[PDB]
């Protein structure tokens, strides 16, 4: 992104032209634009003539895709409303994929990938750590493992101190990371990652709610049936309910019920 806006006015459009030109010749190819929001925020931040001309150059290049030439343009941004709506036109960036923060299962999956090279101890429970990372992205989990690795390092060869350009392998293979090292990393101020609206699958079943079998079967008729038996609703012709209201005294598991029913359907 900023690589293009760093080039002087004129050389900017040249690089964009050369980009598509070089990738089209090497077909099949994938053209990936990084910080697209820094290029085309044509709303209130489109203040000036230079900016608008740069955006249009890309727009022409997007339309300039002859289709028979097989290149696909991908891009990334912080939020949908950052990009210029002219790029949202069905014919350029027509397909959109929302990739929000990972959930509990997501963070667990990530941690194993970032710890695939390091020797994890027996007491280390990655599933536990993934559950208590309330609002963590992929990169923040990396820094979590890294700062915890440094904790495990400042206790081993640190006392020995081997000032060399090449560390011995036997020393590194014997090194291990404990659960307390992950505790220390979480205890610091570095897990302070951005917190958004969490969309996940509830890890709470019906067993956390005593009794109330009547509302269980009631809820299943409202959500389980129109997804597991959509043919039956079309058979009888009725239309599924769009919502339910829970009423009663506080602390009776209204929130727990709403989560539990989502758990039964395995939905978000």
């Amino acid at each position: 992104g900023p690589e293009i806006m760093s080039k002087l006015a004129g050389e900017s459009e040249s690089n964009l032209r050369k980009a598509f030109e070089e990738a089209e010749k090497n077909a099949p190819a994938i053209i990936f634009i990084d910080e697209l929001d820094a290029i085309a925020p044509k709303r209130e931040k489109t203040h000036g003539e230079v900016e608008r001309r740069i955006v249009s150059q890309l727009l022409t290049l997007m339309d300039g895709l002859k289709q028979r030439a097989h290149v696909i343009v991908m891009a990334a941004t912080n939020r949908p409303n950052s990009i210029d709506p002219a790029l949202r036109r069905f014919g350029r960036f027509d397909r959109e994929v929302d990739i929000g923060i990972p959930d509990a299962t997501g963070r667990l999956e990530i941690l194993q990938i970032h710890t695939k090279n390091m020797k994890l101890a027996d007491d280390v429970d990655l599933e536990q750590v993934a559950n208590e990372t309330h609002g963590h992205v992929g990169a923040d989990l990396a820094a979590l493992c890294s700062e915890a690795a440094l904790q495990a390092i400042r206790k081993k060869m640190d006392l020995i101190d081997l000032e060399d350009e090449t560390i011995d392998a036997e020393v590194m293979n014997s090194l291990a990371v404990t659960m307390d090292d992950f505790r220390w990393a979480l205890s610091q101020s570095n897990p302070s990652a951005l917190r958004e609206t969490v969309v996940e699958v509830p890890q709470v079943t019906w067993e956390d709610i005593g009794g109330l079998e009547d509302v269980k079967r009631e809820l299943q008729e409202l959500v389980q049936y129109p997804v597991e038996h959509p043919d039956k609703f079309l058979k009888f012709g009725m239309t599924p309910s769009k919502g339910v209201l829970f009423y009663g005294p506080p602390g009776c598991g209204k929130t727990l019920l709403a989560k539990a029913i989502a758990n039964e359907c395995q939905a978000n």
Binding site: T60, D63, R89, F90
Partner: protein
């Protein structure tokens, strides 16, 4: 003015070998329930089809798709002379050849895939020079009638041997691509096309009239609606259907 000269209108039946007429008109022209008719138009050309009864058609109009439309080299509004031709007999052997720019990607037995199911007991009256279109296999392939044994015109029977020499032909000048846009390639815009057409019909089809008459035609037309409805598609369709030039400004 001869009650046998009619005006080509939009088609309801998208079949390649059909010409729709009104009920009382066929009684005046002495036409039967399947009589092979002969159409003549501009650039001195002929075409053969089958006349049917259309309740939605008017007396002074005749419905036909873009295939017959392009074969006569005419546009919506031109004059054509229809006449009964009962001397048309069955065909014997027919040599036809496809166009190069419509087979790019597919190969093999074109006869069994396109030709055979297309003429399968349809009794389609083709003529030497006609260009018909067969759709299938998730695409469209154009064929041009090169030579027929009962020259010039004959009917394709399901017993008629259909020869395919397998030799791609060049594209002529006045041969408009059937893959392009037309009024039959856009939908949902009923009243939209209705307003649009009658606004740009006269000034485009007869510029001489407006340069002679003291009537002002609309110069600029704006198209509303959300993206994806096919704004550009509509505009190019009018130009391709009226023969007028088209220049786009992105």
């Amino acid at each position: 003015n001869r009650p046998n000269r009619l005006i080509v209108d939009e088609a309801i039946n998208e079949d390649n070998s059909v010409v729709s007429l009104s009920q009382p008109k066929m009684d005046e022209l002495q036409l039967f329930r399947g009589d092979t008719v002969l159409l003549k138009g501009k650039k001195r050309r002929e075409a053969v089809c089958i006349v049917l009864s259309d309740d939605t058609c008017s007396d002074e109009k005749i419905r036909m798709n873009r295939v017959v439309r392009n074969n006569l080299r005419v546009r919506l509004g031109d004059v054509i002379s229809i006449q009964p031709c009962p001397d048309v007999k069955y065909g014997k052997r027919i040599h036809v050849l496809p166009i190069d720019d419509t087979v790019e990607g597919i190969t093999g037995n074109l006869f069994e895939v396109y030709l055979k199911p297309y003429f399968l007991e349809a009794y389609r009256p083709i003529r030497k020079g006609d260009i018909f279109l067969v759709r299938g296999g998730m695409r469209a392939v154009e064929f041009k009638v090169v030579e027929t044994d009962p020259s010039p015109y004959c009917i394709v029977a399901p017993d008629t041997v259909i020869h395919c020499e397998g030799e791609p032909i060049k594209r002529e000048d006045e041969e408009e691509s059937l893959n392009e846009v037309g009024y039959d390639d856009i939908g949902g815009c009923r009243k939209q096309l209705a307003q649009i057409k009658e606004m740009v019909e006269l000034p485009l089809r007869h510029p001489a009239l407006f340069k002679a008459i003291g009537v002002k035609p609309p110069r600029g037309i704006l198209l509303y609606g959300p993206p994806g409805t096919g704004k550009t598609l509509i505009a190019r369709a009018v130009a391709n259907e009226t023969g007028a030039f088209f220049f786009l400004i992105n």
